[PDB]
Amino acid sequence: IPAFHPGELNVYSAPGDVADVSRALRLTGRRVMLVPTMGALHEGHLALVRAAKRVPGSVVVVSIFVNPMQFGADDDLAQLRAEGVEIAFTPTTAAMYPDGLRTTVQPGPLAAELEGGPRPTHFAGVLTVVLKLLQIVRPDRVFFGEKDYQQLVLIRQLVADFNLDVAVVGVPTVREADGLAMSSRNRYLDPAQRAAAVALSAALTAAAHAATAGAQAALDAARAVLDAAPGVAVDYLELRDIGLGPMPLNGSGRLLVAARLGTTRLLDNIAIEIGT
Amino acid sequence: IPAFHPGELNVYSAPGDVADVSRALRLTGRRVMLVPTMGALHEGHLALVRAAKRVPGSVVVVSIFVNPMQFGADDDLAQLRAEGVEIAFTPTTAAMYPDGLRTTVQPGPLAAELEGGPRPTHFAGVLTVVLKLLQIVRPDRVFFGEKDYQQLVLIRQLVADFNLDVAVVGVPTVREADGLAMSSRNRYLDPAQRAAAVALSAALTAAAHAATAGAQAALDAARAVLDAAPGVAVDYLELRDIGLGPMPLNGSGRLLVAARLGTTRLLDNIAIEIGT
């Protein structure tokens, strides 16, 4: 078994090393929490880590892995060490795909909708990677941000559909003071674009309050705010049930927006209570 | 937690009940062994159970589940009780597919070859089911017969590719006295067909000895025996490496045959050492 130093950051890149250390730790009664990331960490990620750390005695494992592009489609560790993360898992593509793209996960039809429209193989990559990380780490709980809501829903589907014995924990989106959802993509915005980008959260929050007057009022309010914003080009604005099926006549839903500011595509979403 | 009576047969049909009992047993140090089946048990299956039972203290879980047909495509429990099996898992289709065919496993290209030629979605069903059973039961070891060799190879691929922490144990084919590989399909043969069916094992065993004289001699020997047999129609006869890639010039391989006797399709395969 590889060395593990309790209460310090331990970095591993071989799947077998993490698997072995995780198994040893779990046997002592320490629950293992997994926070999957693609690196370029910001406060939104630190919130996932802090949610994991609230579980007493937990060993928090943060993975950093950028999934390769499918056909036709740095102070990270220092930040983790400062949060008291004990395990960072940083595998290479070759370690994750030693046999190339061979067995993979085929998501349900939700993967072809919304973010899957522009990128029809994206969620197959995501669910394949997440499934592997879950089997390597065998966490008790795995933490995902609500900012990528469709991703979170699809992970819940993966866990239900393959009978995975892990709790999926969705953590609320961390926002800038003006409401902008944090994302590594925000780094690409110039100051004028960054100012205009507040329109996504403004539109969604306006919709969530407009929703006392019903679903059409909510959608129209959000659209009006987006239409008021300079150089925000809307890709989609959809109201769905909380599992991303069709919106119910009356009840709980989720409103999702995707919009482009110059070359940068941003997403946001919010809980909606229709007629409440 | 559901009742479990040690040293007796316990039958469960809910995935959650097996998951809970298996987890409780594993915590006591009893290793859990899984033997997946489609019921209609014969001695070939009992061999898998006996291999599982050889692991000291093991709780043997035998699943019986017939995977539904995809588009365009009884004394079992008494036998298990007599073998000292403590858990039989007999889920309904609805319990296994409560959300229909949603997330599934997409096998690698080997699934389109050999048995996947006639049935291109068969192994996706097999690997989806096996993945689920592995996550429900969380066994230390899972046992499969070598008779369905391509299935065994594909399961090894599933386990490697998704980083599953389970040992896959292939058990040699159990044969009738004349060499015929046991299979529930043998029940469909009339006496004349049953007698002619010895040709598959005869052809493969002849090939395994002919192989001292090389790969062509082995294939030609097997073909000659099949061609001598009345009302045996050969679907394929292929020599491959042990992972079912291309045969090596000199070395270890596997010879696989599929043939029809009237309406019944039978399979067999054997280890080949080329030039040995």
Domains, chain A, with CATH or none: 1-172 (3.40.50.620), 173-276 (3.30.1300.10)
Give the Cα separation of A268 and B165 in Å (integer). 37
Burial of A110 from C-beta contacts in 10 A (0-12 / 13-18 / 19+): buried
Beta strands A32-37; A10-12: pairing state = unpaired
| Crossing angle of helices B122-137 and B15-27, rounded to 10° | 50
Shortest CA distance to B94 belongs to which of B71, B69, B68?
B68
Which residues of chain B does A135 touch, with a Cβ-Cβ cutoff of 8 Å?
Answer: 162-165
Q: What type of residue sits at position B111?
A: A
> Which residues precede gaps in chain A, with C-N > 2.5 A?
73
Interface test mutation site (partner A, options B161, B164, B244, max chain A beta carbons within 10 A):
B161
Residues B235/B265, Cβ–Cβ less than 8 Å: yes
For B261, the enclosing helix (H) or strand (E) is strand B251-261
Residues B266/B258, Cβ–Cβ less than 8 Å: yes
For residue B97, give the chain A residue with the closest CA: A161
Which residues of chain A does B138 touch, with a Cβ-Cβ cutoff of 8 Å?
Answer: 165
For residue A123, give the chain B residue with the closest CA: B103
For A44, the enclosing helix (H) or strand (E) is helix A43-53
Which residues of chain A does B102 touch, with a Cβ-Cβ cutoff of 8 Å?
Answer: 108-109, 157, 161
Could you tell me which residues come within 8 angstroms of residue A174 by beta carbon, excluding any fewer than 6 positions away? A42, A43, A44, A47, A145, A181, A182
Give the Cα separation of B255 and B211 in Å (integer). 11
Method: X-ray
H-assigned helices in A121-264: 122-137, 149-161, 191-196, 198-210, 215-227
Is B214 annotated as belonging to a binding site? no
> Which residues precede gaps in chain B, with C-N > 2.5 A?
73
Is the Cα dihedral A188, A193, A195, A196 positive or negative? negative
Under 8 Å CB pairs connecting chains A and B tally to: 72
Interface of B with A (CB under 8 A): 15, 19, 23, 99, 102-109, 124, 127, 131-132, 135-136, 138, 157-158, 160-165
Query: Cβ contact (<8 Å) for A163 and B135?
Result: yes
CA distance B95 to chain A (A): 11
For B43, the enclosing helix (H) or strand (E) is helix B43-53
What SS3 class is residue B228?
coil
Shortest CA distance to A276 belongs to which of A242, A253, A243, A256?
A253
- Using alpha carbons, list the distances in angstroms from residue A130 to A92, A143, B156: 15, 11, 20
Residues B63/B133, Cβ–Cβ less than 8 Å: yes
Identify the bridge partners of residue B87 per DSSP, sorted by sequence position.
B10, B61
Nearest to A105 among B15, B106, B109 (CB): B106
Residues B58/B30, Cβ–Cβ less than 8 Å: yes
What is the side-by-side order of every strand in the sheet holding B233-241? B233-241, B251-261, B264-274
Give the active site residue among A5, A45, A122, A209. Answer: A45
Which residues of chain B does A138 touch, with a Cβ-Cβ cutoff of 8 Å?
Answer: 165
For residue B26, give the chain A residue with the closest CA: A27
Output DSSP code: residue B93. Answer: H
CA distance B39 to chain A (A): 22
Give the Cα separation of A226 and A239 in Å (integer). 15
Is the Cα dihedral B145, B148, B153, B158 positive or negative? negative
Residues B31/B55, Cβ–Cβ less than 8 Å: yes
Shortest CA distance to B101 belongs to which of A123, A157, A75, A55?
A157
Residues B170/B152, Cβ–Cβ less than 8 Å: yes
Quoted resolution (Å): 1.7
Is residue B45 flagged as an active site residue?
yes
Identify the bridge partners of residue A55 per DSSP, sorted by sequence position.
none
For residue A101, give the chain B residue with the closest CA: B108
Nearest to B99 among A102, A107, A161 (CB): A161
Shortest CA distance to A240 belongs to which of A258, A252, A225?
A252
Output DSSP code: residue A83. Answer: T
Give the Cα separation of B226 and B259 in Å (integer). 9
Q: What type of residue sits at position B220?
A: D
Tokens 């499934």 belong to residue: A131
Residues A204/A270, Cβ–Cβ less than 8 Å: yes
Nearest to B131 among A124, A127, A162 (CB): A162
Tokens 């006392």 belong to residue: A212
Identify the bridge partners of residue A34 per DSSP, sorted by sequence position.
A61, A142
For residue B165, give the chain A residue with the closest CA: A135
What SS3 class is residue A63?
strand
Q: Which two tokens stand for residue B229?
A: 């047999």
Could you tell me which residues come within 8 angstroms of residue B212 by beta carbon, excluding any fewer than 6 positions away? B275, B276
For B236, the enclosing helix (H) or strand (E) is strand B233-241
Query: Cβ contact (<8 Å) for A136 and B163?
Result: yes
- Using alpha carbons, list the distances in angstroms from residue B181 to A156, B40, B110, B177, B185: 43, 15, 23, 10, 10
Residues B60/B37, Cβ–Cβ less than 8 Å: no
Residues A139/A61, Cβ–Cβ less than 8 Å: yes
Is A146 annotated as belonging to a binding site? yes
Give the Cα separation of B234 and B19 in Å (integer). 43
For B37, the enclosing helix (H) or strand (E) is strand B32-37
Give the Cα separation of A28 and A56 in Å (integer). 13
Query: Cβ contact (<8 Å) for B99 and A157?
Result: yes
Shortest CA distance to A47 belongs to which of A168, A187, A174?
A174
Residues B205/B271, Cβ–Cβ less than 8 Å: no
CA end-to-end span of chain A: 55
Identify the bridge partners of residue A143 per DSSP, sorted by sequence position.
A169
Q: Which two tokens stand for residue A78?
A: 């220092």
Give the Cα separation of A263 and A261 in Å (integer). 6
Shortest CA distance to A267 belongs to which of A70, A44, A19, A73?
A44
Which residues of chain B does A245 touch, with a Cβ-Cβ cutoff of 8 Å?
Answer: none
Identify the bridge partners of residue B37 per DSSP, sorted by sequence position.
B64
Query: Cβ contact (<8 Å) for A132 and B107?
Result: no
Give the Cα separation of B142 and B135 in Å (integer). 12
What SS3 class is residue B233?
strand
Is A185 annotated as belonging to a binding site? yes
Interface test mutation site (partner B, options A21, A161, A165, A166, max chain B beta carbons within 10 A):
A161
Angle at A68 between CA A164 and CA A183, to 5 degrees: 80
Interface of A with B (CB under 8 A): 15, 19, 23, 99, 102-109, 124, 127, 131-132, 135-136, 138, 157-158, 160-165
- Using alpha carbons, list the distances in angstroms from residue A265 to A193, A268, B162: 11, 11, 31
Nearest to A103 among B102, B108, B165 (CB): B108
For residue B101, give the chain A residue with the closest CA: A108
Cα atoms found within 13 Å of the Cα of residue A243, Cβ hemisphere only: 9
Give the Cα separation of A50 and A30 in Å (integer). 16
Shortest CA distance to B32 belongs to which of B4, B62, B12, B76?
B62
Q: What type of residue sits at position A193?
A: Q
Give the Cα separation of A225 and A208 in Å (integer). 13
CA distance B154 to chain A (A): 9
What SS3 class is residue A149?
helix
Q: What is the phi-psi region of residue A219: left when phi exceeds 0, alpha when psi lies from -120 to 50, beta otherwise?
A: alpha
Shortest CA distance to A256 belongs to which of A212, A276, A214, A226?
A226
Give the Cα separation of A94 and B24 in Å (integer). 37
Q: Which two tokens stand for residue B13?
A: 């049909």
Q: Which two tokens stand for residue B37?
A: 């089946």
**Count of H-run helices and E-run strands, chain A:** 9, 10
